[PDB]
Amino acid sequence: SVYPKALRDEYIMSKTLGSEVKLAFERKTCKKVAIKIISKNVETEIEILKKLNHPCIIKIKNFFDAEDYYIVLELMEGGELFDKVVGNKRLKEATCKLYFYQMLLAVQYLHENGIIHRDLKPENVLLSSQEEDCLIKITDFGHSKILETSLMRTLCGTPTYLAPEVLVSVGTAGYNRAVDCWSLGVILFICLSGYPPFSEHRTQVSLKDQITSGKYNFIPEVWAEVSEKALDLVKKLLVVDPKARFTTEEALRHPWLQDEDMKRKFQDLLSEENESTALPQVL
Ligand SMILES: O=C(NCc1ccco1)c1ccc2nccnc2c1
Numbered sequence: 001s002v003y004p005k006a007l008r009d010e011y012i013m014s015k016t017l018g019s020e021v022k023l024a025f026e027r028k029t030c031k032k033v034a035i036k037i038i039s040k041n042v043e044t045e046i047e048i049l050k051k052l053n054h055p056c057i058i059k060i061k062n063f064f065d066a067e068d069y070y071i072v073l074e075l076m077e078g079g080e081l082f083d084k085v086v087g088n089k090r091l092k093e094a095t096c097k098l099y100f101y102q103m104l105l106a107v108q109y110l111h112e113n114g115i116i117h118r119d120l121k122p123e124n125v126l127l128s129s130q131e132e133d134c135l136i137k138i139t140d141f142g143h144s145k146i147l148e149t150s151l152m153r154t155l156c157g158t159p160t161y162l163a164p165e166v167l168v169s170v171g172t173a174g175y176n177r178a179v180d181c182w183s184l185g186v187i188l189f190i191c192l193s194g195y196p197p198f199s200e201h202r203t204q205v206s207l208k209d210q211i212t213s214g215k216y217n218f219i220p221e222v223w224a225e226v227s228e229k230a231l232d233l234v235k236k237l238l239v240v241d242p243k244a245r246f247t248t249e250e251a252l253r254h255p256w257l258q259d260e261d262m263k264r265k266f267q268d269l270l271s272e273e274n275e276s277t278a279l280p281q282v283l
């Protein structure tokens, strides 16, 4: 195989980043980029990502629809968050706070703008730099959904002929976004402990059973090096009933996140990236 003439005309292709993500160079700027190849839902992913504009959400620079789909993204020099947590690697409580706060802001943004990621994992969280204190970006919107429903339209009529299950679904409705709060809860547990909450390692109970019951594997020795504020937040996010489960808003109001130094550090990392783009001010 070869890359399209159109892609080749703007970008110089180099080393593979993840076997599909490649490193390329924009000919115009000589700046480095990341080119995501999705082999022939991608039109929706582009449509979502072109509209979304937030520091903690990955931006589309360019797109090519050929024998395969080619997506040009900003290069995240720190790689995946997954690589920082593999093999029971533990992140300092302060680095968890910084990263998590950014994931909360990013997800709040998505939900405010009616998008549900649906696939939040440490492998979809990208670190901006090789340094511990850095900006994080949420990637991979392949699985995302966009929120007026068929239920809202149905309820405008009289339920003479309406099925009972439809009327029952009304209670639970409009809480699909709560799936992302579960994921953040599972991510936060992994960062804080080095191990996952629900797993088939040294257990008799099925993975479906642990998750449905909401009974995560708790190892005191590991959680002793973690604060009660941190663990309280996990407990509040890893709630079975989605209606009772914490929202990004509630999470962002939690004592663990009321850390003026952490907020300052992110704000300081923000302007650090913004110095490049900065157009002279009016005043
Ligand atoms: O391996 C990566 N970074 C490490 C690194 C350092 C220098 C070049 O690469 C990597 C992987 C997937 C990505 N997907 C979208 C945007 N940036 C990405 C970066």
Ligand SMILES: [Cl-]
Binding pocket: 001, 002, 003
């Ligand atoms: Cl080629």
